[PDB]
Amino acid sequence: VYAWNRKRISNCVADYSVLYNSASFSTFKCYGVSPTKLNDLCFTNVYADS
Amino acid sequence: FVIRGDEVRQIAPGQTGKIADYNYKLPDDFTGCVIAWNSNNLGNY
């Protein structure tokens, strides 16, 4: 946890639908945007901490 | 109707969820009292 990686993703066009269609995910949470309305918005410097 | 465990996480007014969003959602203006209790004793597919 103290040594997380920051992967910056840009210039990408991916289906932001399977990101919640994955049944392996125990529980999916969103705090800033509506989960269904993920495709419409335009992003900037997406981060991929894990 | 019955669900396998992860129920309250999906059954709620204005609550998403694959089973909830594909089978039956509640109205945003809803007035009811849902109850839940295990029926595993009642292996059985």
UniProtKB/Swiss-Prot annotation, chain B:
Effect after changing K18T: In strain: Gamma/P.1
Effect of R9S: In strain: Omicron/BA.2, Omicron/BA.2.12.1, Omicron/BA.2.75, Omicron/BA.4, Omicron/BA.5, Omicron/BQ.1.1, Omicron/XBB.1.5, Omicron/EG.5.1
Region described as Integrin-binding motif: spans on this chain: 4-6
Description of how the protein assembles with itself and partners: Binds to host ACE2. RBD also interacts with the N-linked glycan on 'Asn-90' of ACE2. Cleavage of S generates a polybasic C-terminal sequence on S1 that binds to host Neuropilin-1 (NRP1) and Neuropilin-2 (NRP2) receptors. Interacts with host integrin alpha-5/beta-1 (ITGA5:ITGB1) and with ACE2 in complex with integrin alpha-5/beta-1 (ITGA5:ITGB1). May interact via cytoplasmic c-terminus with M protein. May interact (via N-terminus) with host bilirubin and biliverdin, thereby preventing antibody binding to the SARS-CoV-2 spike NTD via an allosteric mechanism.
Record's function text: Attaches the virion to the cell membrane by interacting with host receptor, initiating the infection. The major receptor is host ACE2. When S2/S2' has been cleaved, binding to the receptor triggers direct fusion at the cell membrane. When S2/S2' has not been cleaved, binding to the receptor results in internalization of the virus by endocytosis using host TFRC and GRM2 and leading to fusion of the virion membrane with the host endosomal membrane. Alternatively, may use NRP1/NRP2 and integrin as entry receptors.
UniProt protein name: Spike protein S1
Lineage of producing organism: Viruses, Riboviria, Orthornavirae, Pisuviricota, Pisoniviricetes
Gene symbol of the encoding locus: S
Coverage span on the entire protein: 400 to 449 of 1273
